Design a protein around this ligand. Structure first.
Ligand SMILES: Nc1ncnc2c1ncn2[C@@H]1O[C@H](COP(=O)(O)OP(=O)(O)O)[C@@H](O)[C@H]1O
Ligand SMILES: Nc1ncnc2c1ncn2[C@@H]1O[C@H](COP(=O)(O)OP(=O)(O)O)[C@@H](O)[C@H]1O
Ligand SMILES: [Mg+2]
Ligand SMILES: [Mg+2]
Lengths: 565, 268, 28
């Protein structure tokens, strides 16, 4: 393979490549647009170290205090039935509804798996709402708290439109901490400085800034308290130990010294910047997603094309057949146009290729035993009936008497293609129940006579072995200038090898991409083994391909030549 | 620069057309002439006889006088692989350069599909080759004289619905047998062989057949497929005529010769 | 046609300078 080969393959498979790449890019774009945007807020913390302060910030002690302050164990999610309903609602300009809940106690099922009880709140109006946990409907109003069915819920300031549903989950305190800890990160940004860069990510831009402010203030209030804790424990035991009198006064001096030390012990933590949310989402990164969608779609399209190229075995040009020594007398293109093509569209590009076969045969059928031409092939639906019936039509217009014998006693349909008095075909003649004169019929828009197959016999291969078949050909060879015999494929049945004994010329029809070169070589050698000499081959169903133009010099399709009017 | 180079590098590795007559002769195809592009409904051999392309056609005229001897008849069929390869340009101008040498030449426009030679010579369009083959015209009523030419010509006539079947009529061989006695040379212009089969029918009655290959448009395999399609129909193609050659430095380095030809006149 | 982008610079004397860098680039 070389540059021309691969470029021709890419040009031929351009529909497949473009479709697969466009599907991948469409999926990438739909993900980049429908994925929930995740924002990031950051704050600045200065340490007067900062390595132990990092582990203290991410502790369940500090983070758990934020969950309690902001009620982060009350999870509220807008209800969208599909996995994309949230993304498309954002694209339609719909502002996401939000409800403020300050008190939530679910019945706490706490079953085998669902440790997170859930209810569904359906907004009815600006003031009242509905609740349904497991079908139990409960009506609630903003303000007045609800204590019914073992369900405590207090909804304040419903900011949404009627009809919107919301999934209200009461997740356990550790799950609320683990979710916060997963999106919350601490860094030093100088590795030596007392500066801590607290970042927090989330889908709600306002909420994550309130959370990171709570984490900072809790760690701030907590840190000052920690240094006092050594002196507070001393002060705690002193108060428990307050009951000779001179020592009692000495304890009073220690009593106030522990009070002042604890109060003034605020240090090691300074919040330089309060949390603000970056309005540009950090995820999804739309550009890298779409770019990967294009590149992944291309490499997938290329490996599929690379596979189909290395896996295909069918014929690509008549050169492949002629490398083996098979004469290709014509290459018939696919006619994009029960009709005879040579009659319906005589100017067709495929009929122009059959005329080139007509003149190639006039030179190849001379010096033959008789004027009988048998047309067979390797596989069914290769074009043996298309070519033989149209070849007979192009030879009939030249003023010759042509007989088309449909010797496909198994699946012959030439009578349907020519207009039929289906009675008394070739079967009825071979079985003795019809005369040779009663089976010949004229093609209406044709110019040649034809013998139909008749009724499908139970022994088609044994009927053709009857001496009547050679009598019909010997009789017809005197009343016609050419007899064209349509036969079944040789790699399916043996009928053509029986008929080919009485035909002076035999041609194989090879389908363009469906048949293989070895398949046609096996067919020609199966004929020769039965005493039938195949003159050559007819490549049928050729299509215009750029790969043939680069691999070989010619695509073998043919040119259109008419005056356009 | 790197974009210009990769585009040039692609066009070089992707092009398959003929680059020199050497490519055709590696396969065993005799190239009798290489006609350059004439940068100059007129006959080039008449409008500009000193043209570089007419000087190359004169070299074909003398190469044919030696190749057309020992032939069956004085009929020369000129065909090709693809349309617009220069078959009508070469055959009509070859007939003009042989007519000035004092010979009686007949140019038959046997392109019954898209023949325009009557437009190129000045036409009484009635009674062409079609009307003769269909029996509605005599052989004497179809021959017409090229005004600024020197040879007679037979136009295609009205476009028939069955051009390939008209040429199979025995009248066509009767016309050639009659014209082969009243003319020193008959040049038959035909459609391309890879388009239709008309040239393979006509080539049965022509003693000499030449293919015209377009310089960059046709491929070497395209011309080999054409010569073997003729031989399969009993037509022996004597050789090829490379047409439309342009001056290229790549040919001068790849092969020793660019095959374009030199200009030789006294400038006054 | 691209808009020309200029650059101004200043020199600051610090009596470290690693925590001073993060303080300069702060939103405060
Ligand atoms: N070159 C072609 N162009 C257009 N249609 C074709 C061509 N060859 C075959 N066909 C169509 O494909 C079908 C197969 O042809 P058929 O004669 O029934 O095959 P076979 O006899 O070899 O089994 C037919 O309907 C025919 O019209
Ligand atoms: N060597 C050439 N130099 C200049 N013009 C040319 C040359 N060959 C062909 N042409 C022009 O290109 C067109 C194609 O020629 P034409 O005879 O119509 O091609 P064909 O008969 O092979 O289909 C004509 O108009 C002709 O004048
Ligand atoms: Mg069939
Ligand atoms: Mg022409």
């Amino acid at each position: 393979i070389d540059l021309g080969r691969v470029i021709g393959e890419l040009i031929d498979h351009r529909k497949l490549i473009i479709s697969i790449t466009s599907v991948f890019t469409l999926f990438a774009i739909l993900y980049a647009l429908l994925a929930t945007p995740i924002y990031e807020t950051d704050a600045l913390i200065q340490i007067e170290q900062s390595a132990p302060e990092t582990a203290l910030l991410q502790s369940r002690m500090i983070l758990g205090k934020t969950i309690d302050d902001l009620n982060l164990q009350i999870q509220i999610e807008q209800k969208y039935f599909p996995v994309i309903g949230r993304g498309l609602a954002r694209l339609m300009g719909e502002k996401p509804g939000n409800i403020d809940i300050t008190r939530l106690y679910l019945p706490d099922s706490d079953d085998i798996s669902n440790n997170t009880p859930s209810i569904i709140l359906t907004v009815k109006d600006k003031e009242n709402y509905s609740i349904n946990s497991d079908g139990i409907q409960l009506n609630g109003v903003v303000g007045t708290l609800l204590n019914e069915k073992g369900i405590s819920l207090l909804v304040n300031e419903i900011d949404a439109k009627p009809g919107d549903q919301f999934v209200i989950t009461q997740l356990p305190r550790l799950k609320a901490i683990s979710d916060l800890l997963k999106s919350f990160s601490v860094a030093d940004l100088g590795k030596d400085t007392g500066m801590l860069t607290l970042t927090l990510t989330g889908d709600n831009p306002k909420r994550i800034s309130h959370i990171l402010d709570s984490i900072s203030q809790n760690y701030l209030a907590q840190n000052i308290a920690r240094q006092a804790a050594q002196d507070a424990k001393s002060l705690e035991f002193l108060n428990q130990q307050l009951p000779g009198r001179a020592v009692y006064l000495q304890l009073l001096n220690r009593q106030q010294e522990l009070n002042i030390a604890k109060s003034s012990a605020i240090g090691n933590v300074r919040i330089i910047d309060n949390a603000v949310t970056d309005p540009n989402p950090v995820r999804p990164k739309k550009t890298i997603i779409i770019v990967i969608g294009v590149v992944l779609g291309l490499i997938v399209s290329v490996v599929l094309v690379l596979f189909q190229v290395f896996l295909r075995r069918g014929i690509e040009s008549p050169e492949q057949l002629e490398e083996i020594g098979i004469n290709v007398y014509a290459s018939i293109p696919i006619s994009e146009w029960d009709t005879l093509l040579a009659v319906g569209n005589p100017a067709d590009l495929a009929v122009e290729a059959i005329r080139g076969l007509r003149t190639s045969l006039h030179f190849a059928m001379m010096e033959a035993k008789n004027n009988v031409l048998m047309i067979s092939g390797a596989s069914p639906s290769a074009g043996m009936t298309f070519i033989s019936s149209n070849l007979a039509a192009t030879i009939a217009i030249t003023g010759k008497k042509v007989l088309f014998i449909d010797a496909d006693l198994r699946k012959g349909y030439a009578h349907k293609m020519f207009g039929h008095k289906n009675d008394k075909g070739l079967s009825e003649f071979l079985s003795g129940q019809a005369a040779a004169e009663m089976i010949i019929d004229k093609v209406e828009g044709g110019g040649f006579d034809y013998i139909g197959r008749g009724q499908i016999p139970p022994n088609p291969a044994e009927l053709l072995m009857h001496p009547r078949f050679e009598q019909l050909l010997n009789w017809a060879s005197q009343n016609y200038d050419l007899i064209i015999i349509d036969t079944p494929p040789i790699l399916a049945v043996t009928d053509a090898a029986i008929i080919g004994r009485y035909a002076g010329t035999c041609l194989l029809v090879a389908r363009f991409e469906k048949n293989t070169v070895k398949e046609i070589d096996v067919s020609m050698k199966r004929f020769e083994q039965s005493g039938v000499v195949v003159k050559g081959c007819i490549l049928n169903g050729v299509v215009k391909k750029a790969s043939s133009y680069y691999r070989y010099g010619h695509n073998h399709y043919g040119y259109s030549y008419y005056d356009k009017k």
